Design a protein around this ligand. Sequence first.
Ligand SMILES: Nc1ncnc2c1ncn2[C@@H]1O[C@H](COP(=O)(O)OP(=O)(O)OP(=O)(O)O)[C@@H](O)[C@H]1O
Ligand SMILES: Nc1ncnc2c1ncn2[C@@H]1O[C@H](COP(=O)(O)OP(=O)(O)OP(=O)(O)O)[C@@H](O)[C@H]1O
Ligand SMILES: Nc1ncnc2c1ncn2[C@@H]1O[C@H](COP(=O)(O)OP(=O)(O)OP(=O)(O)O)[C@@H](O)[C@H]1O
Ligand SMILES: [Mg+2]
Ligand SMILES: [Zn+2]
Ligand SMILES: [Zn+2]
Lengths: 580, 373, 591, 181
Amino acid sequence: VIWGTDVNVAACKENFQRFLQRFIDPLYMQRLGEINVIGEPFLNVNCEHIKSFDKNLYRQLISYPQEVIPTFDMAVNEIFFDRYPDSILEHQIQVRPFNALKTKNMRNLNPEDIDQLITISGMVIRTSQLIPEMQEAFFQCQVCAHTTRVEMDRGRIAEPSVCGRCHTTHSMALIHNRSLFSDKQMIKLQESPEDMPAGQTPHTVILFAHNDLVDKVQPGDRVNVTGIYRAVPIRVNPRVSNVKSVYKTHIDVIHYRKTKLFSEKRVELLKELSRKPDIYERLASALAPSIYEHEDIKKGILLQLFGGTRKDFSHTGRGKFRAEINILLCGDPGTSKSQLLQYVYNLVPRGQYTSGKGSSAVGLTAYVMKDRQLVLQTGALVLSDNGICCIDEFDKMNESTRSVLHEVMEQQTLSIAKAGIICQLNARTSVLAAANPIESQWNPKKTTIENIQLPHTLLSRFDLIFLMLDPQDEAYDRRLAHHLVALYYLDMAVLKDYIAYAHSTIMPRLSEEASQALIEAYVDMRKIGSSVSAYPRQLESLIRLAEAHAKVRLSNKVEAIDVEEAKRLHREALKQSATD
Amino acid sequence: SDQVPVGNIPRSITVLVEGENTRIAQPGDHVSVTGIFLPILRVVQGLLSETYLEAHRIVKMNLTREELRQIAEEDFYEKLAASIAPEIYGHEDVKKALLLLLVGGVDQSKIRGNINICLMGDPGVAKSQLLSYIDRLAPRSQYTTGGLTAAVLRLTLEGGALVLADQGVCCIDEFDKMAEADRTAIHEVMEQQTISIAKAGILTTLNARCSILAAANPAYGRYNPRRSLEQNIQLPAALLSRFDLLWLIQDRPDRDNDLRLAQHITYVHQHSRQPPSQFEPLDMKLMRRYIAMCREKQPMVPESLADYITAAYVEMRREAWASKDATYTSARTLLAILRLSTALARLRMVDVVEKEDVNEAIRLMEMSKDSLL
Amino acid sequence: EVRDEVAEKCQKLFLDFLEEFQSSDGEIKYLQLAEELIRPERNTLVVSFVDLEQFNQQLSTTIQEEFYRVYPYLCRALKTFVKDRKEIPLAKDFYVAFQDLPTRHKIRELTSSRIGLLTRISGQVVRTHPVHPELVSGTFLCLDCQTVIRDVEQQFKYTQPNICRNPVCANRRRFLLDTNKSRFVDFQKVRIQETQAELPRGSIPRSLEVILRAEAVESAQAGDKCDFTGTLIVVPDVLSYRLVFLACCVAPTNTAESIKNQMTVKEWEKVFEMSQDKNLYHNLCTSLFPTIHGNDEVKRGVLLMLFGGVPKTTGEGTSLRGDINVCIVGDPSTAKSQFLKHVEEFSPRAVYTSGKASSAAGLTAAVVRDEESHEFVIEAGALMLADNGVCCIDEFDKMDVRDQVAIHEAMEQQTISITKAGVKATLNARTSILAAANPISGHYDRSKSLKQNINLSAPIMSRFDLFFILVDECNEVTDYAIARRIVDLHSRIEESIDRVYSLDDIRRYLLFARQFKPKISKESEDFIVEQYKHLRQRDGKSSWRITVRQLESMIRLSEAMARMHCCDEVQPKHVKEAFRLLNKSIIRVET
Amino acid sequence: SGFDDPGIFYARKSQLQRRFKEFLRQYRVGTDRTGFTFKYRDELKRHYNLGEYWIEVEMEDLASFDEDLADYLYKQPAEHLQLLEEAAKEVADEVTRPRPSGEEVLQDIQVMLKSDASPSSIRSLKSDMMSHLVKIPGIIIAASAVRAKATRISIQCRSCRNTLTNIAMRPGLEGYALPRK
Ligand SMILES: Nc1ncnc2c1ncn2[C@@H]1O[C@H](COP(=O)(O)OP(=O)(O)OP(=O)(O)O)[C@@H](O)[C@H]1O
Ligand SMILES: Nc1ncnc2c1ncn2[C@@H]1O[C@H](COP(=O)(O)OP(=O)(O)OP(=O)(O)O)[C@@H](O)[C@H]1O
Ligand SMILES: Nc1ncnc2c1ncn2[C@@H]1O[C@H](COP(=O)(O)OP(=O)(O)OP(=O)(O)O)[C@@H](O)[C@H]1O
Ligand SMILES: [Mg+2]
Ligand SMILES: [Zn+2]
Ligand SMILES: [Zn+2]
């Protein structure tokens, strides 16, 4: 065996080659045919299959990944020289294993795991251009043009310092383009923040795609990266050979996995309680228990959590539909709006919290910045591409920001003309905006536009405008206080799993009952407004709400009850916003 | 803080944690370390070399009968209040309020036991001097003017004075002139008792539990009652509501009371001591011992008190509706009143909040509102 | 004193290719091209890649693999070939411009493997930089030994000589440059990116800068699409290196007979059927906007905008517009942006944007400081990106004044002449504009004139060929029918559409129809005159008055409608229908 | 903390040393009837049980066992002789591994060598055979008093105190070589 290891080249190759041919879910030889037909010589492998097939080889694999992988390549190439012995390929088959060790708490990583293959889930934050890394430097004498090359002198390139033909002093200068190069794109990735237990100090690591798997993942992608953990010294000065006793560590990526749920008991349990007739009311009341005397608002945000079913309108040429729900909660200061956003943001997965001010630390926009790599820093909206962005003080925002919010609400994407090029960053978020009335309190008889002073277009894009006020009712003050002092002296986990499963599995589809009910609702609203009348945007909101309400019941189809309650809440939002 | 004498300042010691000992501490942790003190060489009459402490073990740490008789005195807390900056003539009700902040709340279960107090008023009203006495009296404290928040130095997390409070008190003079970014930061502190900072877009969150004692002045000279609150001061009115109490000081020329203060000053000049009060001020160590005893207590709120508490709350909320200007009454106001009452119960060394404690807290709340006159 | 045998051999064979290979006529084309090249302002010899392959296949392969190594030698071969062939000036550069390379890589294909080898690519220019002389062969002079160091080639950076030319002397640090003696070549940097066709959905397009020299310096302009022949090369940057594609020659990206023969027989049959299909007008409108109820005049107006009229140029060097400008003003909702979204989605070369855009370009060309270089660069705007295309601009009432006046110049001239900070340039802009806006206060007061109902300037309104006023009707029938259309659209996730003509079939039909240049029959000339008498006779009161510009829109519509059914001549049927639409497009004041 | 220096821890000459080692210990003489005795191994044990600490060596026997090794000794006697000495040192130790107390400390060996090949005339000599094994006949004419010459030597810097121990002075009539500073 190679020194300091338990690794036999032939036996490991034979065992791996045996695993390729002999497997129980044989799929490896089938995708070998796909690679032979397609010609893409990279054969990615789930390492857990090797664990199931042979844990010792899997253990042996992880211990010495750099050494075992060439054996794996030799196994597959000879298999390709066995299966499809004749073919044409620009390079022979490679392998990109993945999904081996879910020690994904990058905050919990140790020097014990140096040069051991690992996979971790995280969100790529910053990227770069593929670094042209020199690997063989052609050289030419200034005196006699002596042609020579130096090949892979251990990262650095050894200067000749003396010619070979005329043998003069140092005259052989490198020729850049004649030199050989490879691609090494550097990538900076943040540890998956939801996965972290505390999150008090989110972790970031550098990654490198060397000559392969380059540029395939753009910033903001929450993916599982699999590669070899690696550490290197750093010279105290470039000129001197002294180095620090501490090594900065990075990853040489091998595979990117773009990214069942729970066990049978949870799906059984959530399906059991879904059958409760008042699950919609219980879940609404159960949502945010610290709140008191708010049910319409709780139901609306609850429908926003479930959201409408994803709809692919590519065939229609109509563009992407805003399947997500955006609700603006407008109410007096001290009315629990901030607590509602914090509770939802804390509860919700892959969500974000920001404030309308530009002083918000996260920032609701993405823009370039130089280290001096002019690299793009993302935004909370782009970060919450599928999550929920809880925006506080939405009334106090800049017009440039308001234009951005109109765009993403109109498109669920953000267009940024970085440098000169333009990029459309998808943001399919659910926007939980919170605004407060201008002046000390909300002046009655003044419209939301008057008392918040925002464009009619942008506020109209919000499917729901929930108006809440603190009434001047001492009984309400008395009951609220008793509720608080009662609190002075269902768990969120089950509700979170319910919503996640409903997102994952249940995708409500329309019923003609829902179709006719919605059409009846809109024309009734049109007739009421015939004498701020009805608009087809209101129909779209009613469409989305019924999808969410159907998703709440896990019916997997939109029913008339979804339409009826959606119209009820839509009228409640109208009643809350009614002014005439 | 206790180690440093008043005339001195804290001194740092680099410590090298290694192996299993790592990850066992965070900034602001009041830890105790055991290890070897050794030199590191990163030549006059011998070599000069920086020192450090190689870490071995790390641990994150947390009277007489006559004293009890003094505690049993009904004017005990009043005597303690008089002992808070006795040279500062007047403002005794404020001095009581400062005492409540020093003891803080209970944090029963949780509840935000911190008592953030903001002070506004014309320059030259003992405001700055009051904070200094509190910092001296405080067992653990930080003083700042407006760094305040954490940072990622270049590659290390360096905690600001807000973090270094850590359930102490972060006295903040010149509060009105704070950077608006810091205003947002302290908003999070009063909201969640945490500080989120992102130098490299990495929202690192630090447990900044502490009570914030703010001090500001109205712009353009002295306060103008004809000009509304926040008309003379350039702070978000919402942030003012976040404070548990907000006391206003106005330079009303009152020839008699001003003369009384002048008499107080002249005595201090002629004696280097305040005039002999009814109860003499006590040594700060004795005060801190009483505070430490008060932190031992966590008085509860019986549900019978809730009926009267809610009765008082709706009454003052009605007064707010009667007031032409909204007086910031809300559930925030109720919760603060709960903090004050249980804080008073800690001063009483009684594990049940009394109606007396509730009433006095309302009195201070009313006076703070009356200060807005 | 070391000779590259491969480059020397390649040079000789390339010289043999120049002086033996010939056209189908049997005469040496490259002698004639060199004969043309003797004139001033002419130094790049255009050469077909396949020709040198046919002359010597191995020569092409060696040039392909070793383009950087051998290309300087080919320039020497051209210099020797051109110097003796005629009285060429002794001192001016000569270049070999290659083209017709079958290998058209995408930008994503580019790797370190492609450094130094010949290659062709296609993409869209983003921004263009000024021209700059740049030293290529330094002529230095040591301070101490006073030996003029010459032929010290610089690899695109200030590379001084390694040591003194005199071996005895070891100054090594004080090589004074001779500016005049050192060889200089003009380089212009231009940014390019992947075209929309090559760009995957939701993926950031690649960006690359290219160096332009010789006649290729201003071959292209900002915001256009072009194919670039040359090689990828490495340049050091502050052992770091970065990739730039030196495009030796550049061409624009990619007759009715040529398309029809290029078109497959089945595609030919469908297109010929579509042209033969009478009443294609309405049936295509229904197909193009399946998720729409009513507003068929909008669908018809959009389709005519898609076809566009026949552009013409007078003998006085004045351009008569071919395309048109169409605006839609409507109440909140009412599907304007949805109409624009359908147009942008279906149509290639169609770009969607909004009047709220705050980018540096601001929908048009701009002269903006480089973040890194700190010099100004010509950044093209989406109007420039949509040159010979379509711009689906939203919130047209909410545009910027600088953009509005700049857009006014574009529609006025079909070009924009930009000058700022000493930099000066002009760019063609022949783009059909689809404006979407809303009335003032959101709701259209039909009792008020259109000028009163919107904030747009009168010249801008005058220069818009068509207007569509979409008022929020309280009519339940339209509201119910739209609701059924939307609900069936949502409920029937797909197949709700009724596309009598497939989208690709329409697109190829647009291309084949666009090859035509329909003429105006003398019947149509008088009928156009007669219809303009009717409009002048109408004289209203209209929301806007009548001028000669109305006739200009009328003829551009009639040319488009002669292009609709591929007929190469306008008929009175086309003219009256155009008169019907535009006259219907006039909304009289309903006070 | 930089105040202490940890010590670094851990054609082919070692291959040649192995070749001598196997040759000395594993060379067999005699036959099956007389036993295939290990001449050098037994003589070494005899010689180290006694105080001889030398061995005769038959160059022809080395040639028969390994022609290349003898050729190397002819070509470059000095280096290969030294390696042969180290092999002789090693094989002697393992042969006599359980030496009596104190005697376990090991003493070097003079590997004396003989060749049955004929001598060469001293008149037939050239510088080509410098650093080459030579064999000649003759009669001795004079002898010197036996003395002690230093092979392992150590010196101290007189002022700096820098000590340079275990310096090897090559055998022969060579002088000393002091440090520069
Ligand atoms: N209807 C209610 N039910 C329960 N708690 C309430 C209700 N109204 C107010 N509260 C309580 O009042 C306090 C309001 O705090 P919070 O900061 O969340 O208010 P807010 O209205 O969002 O404030 P702002 O708009 O000033 O940011 C919290 O204690 C909240 O629990
Ligand atoms: N009520 C008071 N009783 C006793 N001394 C007072 C009182 N008010 C002010 N002083 C004295 O005023 C002197 C100078 O003013 P002082 O330091 O109190 O200002 P300040 O209120 O901190 O002002 P600012 O916040 O504007 O800097 C102090 O030495 C303090 O002793
Ligand atoms: N006449 C109509 N026929 C069919 N669908 C319609 C019609 N008018 C509106 N709609 C529907 O209205 C829905 C919402 O309209 P949309 O968001 O496209 O409006 P918009 O034109 O962008 O509005 P605005 O720019 O005034 O805010 C669209 O999905 C479209 O299906
Ligand atoms: Mg729109
Ligand atoms: Zn040379
Ligand atoms: Zn010189």
